[PDB]
Write a protein that binds this ligand. Structure first.
Ligand code: MG
Ligand code: MG
Ligand code: MG
Ligand code: MG
Lengths: 100, 8, 276
């Protein structure tokens, strides 16, 4: 079967200010089929109780989901999103970079 | 309101 | 401006793991306002935007019944599709459908939609005339023959031109403060040295609604389409959207580049430059 691998963007809801509470988003899109595993990571460890949007899809039939949680940016802490999908042999990790 | 869809 | 109501239906079989899950989500433009999920502990059409909460019990009951009937119809459709493609009972498959209506600034029907995909590939669609079908292959021609025999297009046209448009107009009035408000992007240009020889200019658009936007870079007035990295418009989680466009520029040539932004919420289009 023809399948489509996810695009991944990791970013904040509001402009990042060190020490100011914010929301960390991992937006996965462009993928098919719809089953997908997404973790948000803080210093390499899974953040618990991350919420996500209801499954929907784009005009090209590819799916999209937004995973999100509260976070506080700091110089010391690193955040990331880890995605697995049938199209991937290993989980894909995208680091949060406040410049993107 | 939604519509009842038809079987393929 | 113009507005749309759309429902997005996904059904996914999972042999050995129960019956196929069905989820319906409803949107007005970029705003989700309802969901229904057969995998919820108590499946029910549920509000997802504040302005729909005022609808009375009849709306919730009728939409839940429609969605529960649709769960069964989609599971029958998935059984039929596995047969039409001579597929094994072992694999998982996906049936998606989108439908709804678009109106112009005066509330008049612009057009209707009803179209389906199997395993991510177009399967059958109602044509813009709301009276005939386009089938992708000989399996979808079976569905088309069945729907022609049962005059399904006539039923969908009545829904799309009637119920669909009337409800879209009702939602637009009930949610007028958000659905009929365009929030302009907040825009700025950042600069990121790469090496002694080059730097990235990134043009940001933040906080905008709806998601349609034009964001481009020009060099000396010429569009830089092939050299621009343009990320997909992404949800902020607060109703609004974000997007950026980046170009790699020779060090010292930053002022030759301009970022151009168009969006419904802006009184006039914007031209921005790096402001060091
Ligand atoms: Mg995998
Ligand atoms: Mg199943
Ligand atoms: Mg099937
Ligand atoms: Mg499909």
């Amino acid at each position: 079967m023809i399948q489509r691998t996810p695009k991944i963007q990791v970013y904040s809801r509001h402009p990042a200010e060190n020490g100011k509470s914010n929301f960390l988003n991992c937006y996965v899109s462009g993928f098919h089929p719809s089953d997908i595993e997404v973790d948000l990571l803080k210093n390499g460890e899974r953040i618990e109780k991350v919420e996500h949007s209801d499954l929907s899809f784009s005009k090209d039939w590819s799916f999209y989901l937004l995973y999100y949680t509260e976070f506080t940016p700091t110089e010391k802490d690193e955040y990331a999103c880890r995605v697995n999908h049938v199209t991937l042999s290993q989980p894909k990790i995208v680091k949060w970079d406040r410049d993107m | 309101t939604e519509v009842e869809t038809y079987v393929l | 401006g113009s507005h749309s109501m759309r429902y997005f239906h996904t059904s996914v079989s999972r042999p050995g793991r129960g019956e196929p899950r069905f989820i319906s989500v409803g949107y007005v433009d970029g705003t989700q306002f309802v969901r229904f999920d057969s995998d919820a502990a108590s499946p029910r059409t549920e509000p997802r935007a504040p302005w729909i909460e005022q609808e009375g019990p009849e709306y919730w009951d009728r939409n839940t019944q429609i969605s529960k009937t649709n769960t069964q119809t989609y599971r029958e459709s998935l059984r039929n599709l596995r047969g039409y493609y001579n597929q094994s009972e072992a694999g998982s498959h996906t049936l998606q459908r989108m439908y709804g209506c678009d109106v112009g600034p005066d509330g008049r029907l612009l057009r209707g939609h009803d179209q389906s995909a199997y395993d991510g590939k177009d399967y059958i669609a109602l044509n813009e005339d709301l009276s005939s079908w386009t089938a992708a292959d000989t399996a979808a021609q079976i569905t088309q023959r069945k729907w022609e025999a049962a005059r399904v297009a006539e039923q969908l046209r009545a829904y799309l031109e009637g119920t669909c448009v009337e409800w879209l107009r009702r939602h637009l009035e009930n949610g007028k403060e958000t659905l009929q408000r365009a929030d302009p992007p907040k825009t700025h240009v950042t600069h990121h040295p790469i090496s002694d020889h080059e730097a990235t200019l990134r043009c940001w658009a933040l906080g905008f609604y709806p998601a349609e936007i034009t964001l481009t870079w020009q060099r000396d007035g010429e569009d830089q389409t092939q050299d621009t990295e343009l990320v997909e418009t992404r949800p902020a989680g607060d109703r609004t959207f974000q997007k950026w466009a980046a170009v790699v520029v020779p060090s010292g040539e930053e002022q030759r580049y301009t970022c151009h932004v168009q969006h419904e919420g802006l009184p006039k289009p914007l031209t921005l430059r790096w402001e060091p």
